Symmetry: C2
Subunit: 154 residues, 2 copies
């Protein structure tokens, strides 16, 4: 386990033949209101475009997933709600340890008028159609939100 780089959002290390990227864990929040899902978009230099995602972000030191979820939702959209843990997933276990904890948010209320991040309320059916037509791209969190909705929220 040798480190070739210790950065801000990640560290690059080696374990023999394997290249490993250590990354802070993350959270994502699925929120539905009047049939529309709460998506967000922002410039992502790593991909060169703005995919459709859901409120998400890194878990800061001292925070547990639930607290981080509350914060990301408030900071990115200015909303608060009753959160319920759903499940988690490793974004790409073949090279990184980033683990994402997904929550469901209900009974949304605005806690701050002042939420870089574009808030995009959109019916999940519409998001899926636009993607199938090649009009928009998805981040893992956005796709998970869309699939979760079709599976358990209709």
């Amino acid at each position: 386990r040798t480190y070739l780089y210790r950065g801000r959002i990640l560290n690059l290390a080696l374990e023999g033949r394997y290249e490993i990227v250590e990354h802070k864990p993350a959270v994502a929040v699925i929120a539905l209101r009047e049939g529309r899902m709460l998506f967000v978009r922002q410039m992502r230099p790593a991909v060169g475009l703005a995919p459709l995602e859901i409120p998400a972000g890194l878990i800061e030191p001292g925070e547990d997933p639930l607290e981080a979820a509350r914060r990301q939702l408030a900071e990115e959209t200015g909303l608060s709600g009753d959160l319920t843990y759903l499940f988690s997933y490793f974004v790409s276990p073949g090279f990184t340890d980033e683990k994402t904890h997904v929550f469901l948010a209900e009974n949304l209320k605005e806690v701050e008028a002042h939420p870089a991040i574009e808030v995009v309320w959109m019916r999940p059916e519409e998001a899926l159609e636009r993607h199938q037509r090649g009009e928009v791209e998805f981040s893992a969190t956005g796709l998970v939100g869309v699939l979760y909705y079709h599976a358990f929220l209709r």
Copy 2:
């Protein structure tokens, strides 16, 4: 766009204040048979455990997503089938450009008796329950497969 490392499965670069990890695109295959989903497990040094995933892998030079999907399915499980493109997603757009193309596989047939990789046929409902109980972890591909099944394959 400065490079601090050019490796095998990834490159580490910088774009001002952003740390970017360039990674080859990938594919994942969702397959259902007799109510069981085709999951796979393998040691993943980056995470320290073996999460529940679905057949997946990198797209090699010269290959398009469909061809890569056929190959990963055959090499990891020894099966072949009729593949249909479903959708794609960026695993973690906040730091990497890895994009995953997901396919559905139907009418499975064994093409090789000789498929590191553990083949795990399991009902998606069971996979979800075990995860909720904290008995198993999910990779993004495994979770996407489970959610896709609950949304459109029942």
